[PDB]
Amino acid sequence: GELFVRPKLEEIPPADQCRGFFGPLNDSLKFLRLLDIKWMMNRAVAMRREYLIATPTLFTFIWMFTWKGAVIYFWGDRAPPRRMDWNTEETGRLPLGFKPTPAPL
Amino acid sequence: MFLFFFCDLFWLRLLLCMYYCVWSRLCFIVYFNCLMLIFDFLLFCLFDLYLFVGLCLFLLLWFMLFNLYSLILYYCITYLNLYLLFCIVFLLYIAFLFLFCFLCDFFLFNNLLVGDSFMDVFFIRFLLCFLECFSLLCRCLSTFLRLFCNLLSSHFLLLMFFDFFYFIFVFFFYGVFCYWFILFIFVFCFCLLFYVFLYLLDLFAAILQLFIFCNMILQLIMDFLLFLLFV
Amino acid sequence: VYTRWKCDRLPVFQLKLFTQEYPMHAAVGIFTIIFLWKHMSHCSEETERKYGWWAGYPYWRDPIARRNETKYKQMIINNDVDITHPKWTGCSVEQLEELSRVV
Amino acid sequence: EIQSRKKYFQTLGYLVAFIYLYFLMPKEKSFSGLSGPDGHWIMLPKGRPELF
Amino acid sequence: SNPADHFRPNLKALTLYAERQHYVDRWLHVKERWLAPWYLPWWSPLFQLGTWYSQRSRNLFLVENHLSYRPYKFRRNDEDRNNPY
Amino acid sequence: MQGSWSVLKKNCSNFFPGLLAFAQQTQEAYGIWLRIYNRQQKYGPTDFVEQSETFSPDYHKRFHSQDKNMWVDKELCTEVSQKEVARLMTYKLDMWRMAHCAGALLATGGYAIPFGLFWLANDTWVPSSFNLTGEELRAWREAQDLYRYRSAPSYLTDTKWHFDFHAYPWNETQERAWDDLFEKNDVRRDPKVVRPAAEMYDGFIKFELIRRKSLRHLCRSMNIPTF
Amino acid sequence: STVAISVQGLHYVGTGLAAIALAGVGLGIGTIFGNLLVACARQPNLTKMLFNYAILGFALTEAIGLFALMLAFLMLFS
Amino acid sequence: STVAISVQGLHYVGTGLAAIALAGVGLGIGTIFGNLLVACARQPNLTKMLFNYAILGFALTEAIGLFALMLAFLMLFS
Amino acid sequence: STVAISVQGLHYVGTGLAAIALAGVGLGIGTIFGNLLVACARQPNLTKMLFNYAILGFALTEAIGLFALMLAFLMLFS
Amino acid sequence: STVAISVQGLHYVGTGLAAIALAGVGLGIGTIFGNLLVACARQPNLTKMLFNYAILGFALTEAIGLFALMLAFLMLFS
Amino acid sequence: LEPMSTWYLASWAMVWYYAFFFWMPMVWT
Amino acid sequence: TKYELKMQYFDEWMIRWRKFQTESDWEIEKGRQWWRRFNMAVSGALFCGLVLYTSGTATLKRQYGLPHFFDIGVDGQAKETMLKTLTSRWRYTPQGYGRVLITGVPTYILFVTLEHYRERRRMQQYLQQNTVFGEQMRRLLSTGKIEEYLPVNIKATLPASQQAIYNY
Amino acid sequence: FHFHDVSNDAIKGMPPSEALHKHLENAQLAHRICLAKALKAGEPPVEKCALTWGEVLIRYQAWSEYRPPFQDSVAQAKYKKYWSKKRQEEDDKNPF
Ligand SMILES: CCCCCCCCCCCCCCCCCC(=O)OC[C@H](COP(=O)([O-])OCC(O)COP(=O)([O-])OC[C@@H](COC(=O)CCCCCCCCCCCCCCCCC)OC(=O)CCCCCCCCCCCCCCCCC)OC(=O)CCCCCCCCCCCCCCCCC
Ligand SMILES: CCCCCCCCCCCCCCCCCC(=O)OC[C@H](COP(=O)([O-])OCC(O)COP(=O)([O-])OC[C@@H](COC(=O)CCCCCCCCCCCCCCCCC)OC(=O)CCCCCCCCCCCCCCCCC)OC(=O)CCCCCCCCCCCCCCCCC
Ligand SMILES: CCCCCCCCCCCCCCCCCC(=O)OC[C@H](COP(=O)([O-])OCC(O)COP(=O)([O-])OC[C@@H](COC(=O)CCCCCCCCCCCCCCCCC)OC(=O)CCCCCCCCCCCCCCCCC)OC(=O)CCCCCCCCCCCCCCCCC
Ligand SMILES: CCCCCCCCCCCCCCCCCC(=O)OC[C@H](COP(=O)([O-])OCC(O)COP(=O)([O-])OC[C@@H](COC(=O)CCCCCCCCCCCCCCCCC)OC(=O)CCCCCCCCCCCCCCCCC)OC(=O)CCCCCCCCCCCCCCCCC
Ligand SMILES: CCCCCCCCCCCCCCCCCC(=O)OC[C@H](COP(=O)([O-])OCC(O)COP(=O)([O-])OC[C@@H](COC(=O)CCCCCCCCCCCCCCCCC)OC(=O)CCCCCCCCCCCCCCCCC)OC(=O)CCCCCCCCCCCCCCCCC
Ligand SMILES: CCCCCCCCCCCCCCCCCC(=O)OC[C@H](COP(=O)([O-])OCC[N+](C)(C)C)OC(=O)CCCCCCCCCCCCCCCCC
Ligand SMILES: CCCCCCCCCCCCCCCCCC(=O)OC[C@H](COP(=O)([O-])OCC[N+](C)(C)C)OC(=O)CCCCCCCCCCCCCCCCC
Structure with missing residues (x-):
């Protein structure tokens, strides 16, 4: 809609103010910020880096709407059957008495 | 499997060659909004926002040569297939979308995250972003589905009504010479009125559907355009 | 003055149009x-029988069988295939x- | 001048094509077999005994 | 049914059939003929464009180990749901 | 200019001498550019050396900024002469075209030979070193001028039409400058009258916001390969 | 015991159900024009502009009815 | 076992369902006229332009009702 | 196996459904007369023209009702 | 006794019922544009802004119909 | 219905692709 | 040597006759897949390194400077370390076609060379196999033609319940 | 000689490999019967046994393409993950 201006370094709130799923992950819990997705989302919104949330989604949709959708439809592995036809590992081996051709030399 | 067939435009191609060997002005366009995207002066766009004009005009010409002339009996809409229309809309829509995505400006997608900071990010805004990203593809699908369904339904109805009219006209016109001629005359007048109404409705609906088809693409383009102000 | 649409020939203009005007499309x-x-x-043959013929599949002559027969005869004759091979x-x-002597 | 000549020739060609299509060309895969081809295979291998 | 039959192309002229194996093999022969000459080194982008993607797809097909059965692409009858063969 | 058999013969005859001369010019121009680059890195402004980023206000795409990413070395005469600079510029053009041709050759292997035949039949994209006589050089310059004539009007019309359709000048002097800027060469344009158009267009479009199509037209008009 | 039955006539029932979707569409279209009349009487200077927006809304609303009508034809002709 | 059944009278059921599609059409038309009266009462000089738009809305709404009616008669004769 | 069945009580069910459409018509009548009174109060001078338009709306809505009613009676006696 | 039956024409009924959901979507769209037309006449200067919100509702309203339309295909073609 | 069919979709779409890649330039010029 | 032209026919034949694919051949193909992924990873690492080295000084300052998204403390330390390491020495920071060439040509060369030599390795592996696939590969390299229906000609091993066809 | 039963009812409870092999054997049997009839009649085999040879060819193509999956760690993991005890009980309960 309107033009977007990146926030200045002084306009970005501190990391400690961000909230996670339950509460802020302040000192003694900073390393939990990596695992809390909601905290990362709130931090990105605070830093005006909303694209980190939107870009992966849209692209994913495209990737599914374009390339993986048909790949799954045409070449995907359906659910296995109840009675399974496992491989006896007997096929392929050359018969006894066969003289294979020599390898290149 | 390779099937060799031909479109039903050969006579129309001949007419185009005959009547357009010399130049002529064009002043009436089905979708004029592709030429006037900006209405407030001093606003300009660095993106190629007028790239769609040629494709719009060609699509209008092609779809009009097919659909409008299809009202003539036995005229065939050679392209009338669901997945073929899907391919056409896929081409146009995905081409413009990949034009926007190849720009490699991620901030362009900031508006996908609906709402303000007050709304919970994970439980509200993220779900809205998911829904909007789904809604883009759904808009593509709805465009092609609408274009297919309108033609299919209109022509089915026309065929059925024409069959009924032929039946009553051929096998019950003798009632004109009988004592129940008034009933037949009333029915015949009603059938004529229905014939005219259906033809007018189809004529209008074809053009309107083309307008909407082009407007969906233009809306896709406009959703990601940003205008600078001259100073 | 030079313009692509007026000065260039049709193949050249086509290439230019689809390479520098509408390449992504x-x-x-x-x-x-x-x-x-x-x-x-x-x-498939069954699909052709169901929907592949304007008025329906003419089973009374089975053109698919004749087509496949011609195909296989041509392949055998040209490739010198021994159809009597044990395989x-x-x-x-x-x-x-x-x-053969039995039947 | 160029476009007039080109369009004249194109018009003649399209006229011939229209006549042939709508008055002479038979439809493929006729039920009776009296008109049109029933289809045939192409690109069949030739002179490749090892292929079989 | 009959009204539905009116929505068909009206100028069908000829139908040709060809097996996937045959024309794929012919295409491979053409590609080998055009990519064989010495003046096109294997490290050229053209040669890699020609060969690498096909090799990758074929390798992916070979590596496939699916628990389900994929019916033959070119059966005589693929309209029966209860008969994958 | 269209290709011809005479030009093909000329370029085929002078192919190897032209390559040798191009190599010598390459060595000389590398020396000159080394001097210039060392001077730029040593005495250049911090923004110019560090390659400061200038992003567009709409899509935030980086491009060269005329004020920050361009620097005039007022004291370059001490190290490099005017003739050396002209030689470097000419070699830059020739090297650009030769580099594009070499890239095509490497990409397509030996299949570029017929395209090379098309290339040597025209002087538009051959280096200046392929001309060993005055007449050949004159023909080469004629071909370059023909390409410039072919390309420039499109660029001028693009600029003028976009501005006039999406904006108008603020004051009468700007109007006069804008109108007189795009006059034909048969009349003489007064630079003092035309200069305010620079500020007006800076208000409209700076070099950092130049569109890709206009850039393509400009590079065509500057005899810079675009493919 | 395993018994498989195929009733032919059911396709009529499904076809009739889809037609019910037109009740909402037909009503929805009438709602648009009702507001159009009540709006043109409140600001007649924009009658042409309003008429344009009404037509756009009619097609979008009409489009949905076609989706249902397509299903009716599919089942009625299968 | 494979059993094929053909129920005759089902076409009556499907036809009745399509008739329900005329409920919204009839309601939609009534809505347009109701809004027309208010618009005329609130702007009496526009007794013709509003009337024309009401007719246009009726025509489109009638068209939807006729699309359904075609199926209603068609199934009744199938 | 091929089995043909003819149920002779399903010509009643279809008839009942066709009667349901009358509700969409009857309600439509009330809407026109529901807003006619308001219009008359707003502009009593036009008690005549509004009444004529309301009659036109009622007749057209009733026309839909009778189209549905025709299907109701046809399936009742057939 | 254990008896298993498979009625092979029932998917028509499910498809028609899903199609009925389109009536609400069509009605909602008509309501949106009806409010748009009666809202522009009140604040014309903001006509364009209202139109954008109106389309947004259509985008968020037509999507629901697709789910119902999606189910129709998943049962019609299965 | 052929409109819902896919057994010759590619050949069917060749018409649109020919129109886009070969006839559109002629109409353009 | 161009091994792909020879190997394409063999791969197509194996896909057509994948029933006789022993577990050894499957392991070979899985190893080929793994090596392709490894080549992709190393080429991408090289591309990223070249991009970082040729990045402009201001670009590096912006990327590896304040603010910190997490602000844990390790993030800032690592960013400062990398920024100092990159900005300490002089780096050639080209733009345009030059950066494209520098970042891409090495990556393309590495990826192509690795893939080609892995294809040669796979050809050798199939040559050393003692299965019907190995015999087909050897015959292809000898006569230059693919012999289809070879497994049924030389009577390659089949499951105990499918040996009736060989009963002749 | 005896043709195998490859009807839908019989095919339902059969592994894919067995069905493909049975189809191939039936095709071979039909081809040899046609060849024997041709030899008894004395007419050329190519003019009578082309269609049977083509059927044998297509059955061979279908039979040689299928490779039963190898039983390994990942395949067994997938099979056990999908076929849980709850799913097995549900399948047993279902009469279809
Ligand atoms: C085995 C049997 C034979 C068949 C073999 C086939 C082999 C196939 C190989 C495998 C292919 C697999 C893939 C197939 C996919 C098919 C998809 C498809 O069809 O999609 C539908 C789609 C339909 O498109 P459309 O919208 O209808 O428009 C296309 C039209 O062509 C119209 O579009 P347009 O108007 O925009 O086109 C431009 C047009 C612009 O307008 C014109 O130029 C006007 C003319 C139009 C001509 C073309 C229309 C043809 C109309 C029907 C046929 C006309 C009559 C033929 C009579 C035949 C009698 C037996 O210009 C031209 O057409 C240029 C050509 C002009 C030729 C003029 C020749 C003049 C000769 C004069 C000689 C004088 C001699 C004097 C001697 C005097 C001595 C004294 O088809 C296509 O897009 C084209 C598909 C082609 C695919 C490639 C096929 C391979 C090439 C085969 C050539 C065979 C030549 C040998 C035949 C010999 C006779 C038997
Ligand atoms: C064998 C494997 C082959 C692989 C496949 C290749 C396929 C073909 C692709 C093209 C390959 C290059 C072709 C040769 C170009 C000539 C050399 C060159 O760069 O000329 C300078 C020139 C630089 O242009 P610029 O715009 O002035 O550069 C701006 C910079 O700011 C300039 O910076 P500055 O302003 O500070 O000034 C510096 C200037 C100052 O210098 C001077 O002023 C003196 C003159 C120096 C340049 C002289 C060039 C002479 C060109 C003609 C040569 C003779 C041709 C003879 C032909 C006839 C033969 C019979 O010096 C330079 O120009 C240096 C530029 C940077 C070096 C670029 C080279 C990097 C690649 C080589 C290393 C590879 C190592 C592999 C390690 C492997 C590890 C596993 O190059 C060009 O004109 C650009 C190329 C134009 C064609 C582009 C085609 C598309 C490329 C896409 C590539 C994508 C990645 C690869 C995968 C492709 C898959 C599709
Ligand atoms: C020994 C030498 C030294 C060593 C080597 C050194 C290195 C050399 C190489 C580098 C040289 C670079 C410079 C080259 C300059 C010249 C370029 C050029 O061509 O100029 C035009 C050149 C004339 O130039 P000019 O007269 O000097 O005018 C220049 C002006 O300045 C006009 O200038 P302009 O700018 O206006 O012209 C530009 C025009 C240039 O174009 C043209 O002018 C078109 C040329 C062709 C026109 C053909 C017309 C005739 C058609 C005939 C059809 C057949 C007829 C029937 C035949 C029956 C036979 C029995 O347009 C373009 O630039 C378009 C570029 C398009 C790029 C396409 C990129 C596609 C990418 C694909 C998408 C990828 C996306 C990413 C996907 C990623 C996925 C992961 O054209 C010709 O001479 C025409 C030649 C026609 C030959 C005959 C027809 C074709 C024969 C084919 C035979 C096939 C045999 C095998 C068949 C096998 C079947 C199984
Ligand atoms: C710029 C464009 C913008 C416009 C976009 C416009 C379009 C819209 C966007 C969306 C796309 C629409 C779709 C259009 C169609 C395009 C074609 C398509 O979709 O084809 C897919 C198509 C899908 O394959 P398929 O044909 O379906 O076959 C499926 C098979 O999987 C195939 O099998 P395969 O043998 O080919 O192998 C494929 C392999 C591909 O992958 C590989 O081959 C291996 C990995 C490659 C890495 C590449 C380099 C990455 C950077 C290296 C490091 C750099 C830094 C170095 C310095 C470090 C200092 C410390 O993937 C896999 O199989 C998955 C393996 C995953 C292993 C995971 C192991 C577990 C540990 C690692 C993960 C978990 C870590 C947790 C950490 C937790 C920490 C707390 O092709 C592929 O995806 C595979 C081939 C192409 C691979 C390209 C690799 C590079 C990708 C780009 C990376 C950089 C850019 C992204 C980041 C940007 C940041 C700013
Ligand atoms: C036959 C050959 C076939 C080749 C196939 C390969 C593709 C084509 C090859 C190349 C073709 C030639 C042309 C290429 C494009 C040229 C673009 C250009 O003009 O750049 C100028 C530009 C120079 O201008 P500059 O002023 O110096 O700098 C640009 C400014 O910063 C600009 O400033 P700014 O303001 O614009 O800043 C923004 C700028 C900032 O970026 C830059 O400009 C920096 C350079 C790029 C950095 C990219 C790496 C980012 C970090 C990746 C981290 C990955 C971690 C993954 C970890 C996984 C762990 C398991 O752009 C971005 O932000 C874009 C970031 C990239 C986003 C990627 C999104 C991908 C989404 C994927 C969707 C899903 C895919 C499918 C599913 C896959 C998974 C299953 O060049 C560059 O910066 C680098 C150019 C590199 C060219 C590509 C080299 C190709 C090498 C190929 C090697 C492999 C060959 C394989 C062959 C296979 C057999 C045949
Ligand atoms: C009666 C049944 C009716 C069913 C109807 C079903 C709906 C049918 C609708 C058809 C009409 C609409 C079609 C819309 C378009 C769909 C597009 C789609 O899904 O296509 C996907 C498909 C996927 O291809 P694929 O199916 O071959 O996938 C191969 C994947 N393996 C090998 C694992 C099996 O795309 C193509 O077919 C085109 C592929 C070639 C072109 C792209 C090449 C570049 C690929 C880049 C990534 C990988 C390489 C590395 C990078 C590059 C290196 C150089
Ligand atoms: C912009 C709006 C345009 C509106 C145009 C309005 C045209 C009004 C036509 C009035 C009636 C014309 C009757 C023609 C009778 C022809 C002979 C005949 O038997 O026909 C019966 C046919 C069919 O009548 P039928 O269905 O009774 O046929 C009975 C035949 N049996 C019993 C065997 C089935 O008439 C028609 O189909 C006419 C329909 C016309 C509909 C309007 C089409 C408009 C679009 C095409 C415009 C083309 C312009 C091209 C100009 C050049 C372009 C470069």
């Missing part, structure tokens, strides 16, 4: 064409002769 169209010819270019029949030539 051309790329997507080629992608879709490849997809169609990779996944939507086959029709095709599943039995030795002598067994085939015994069966």
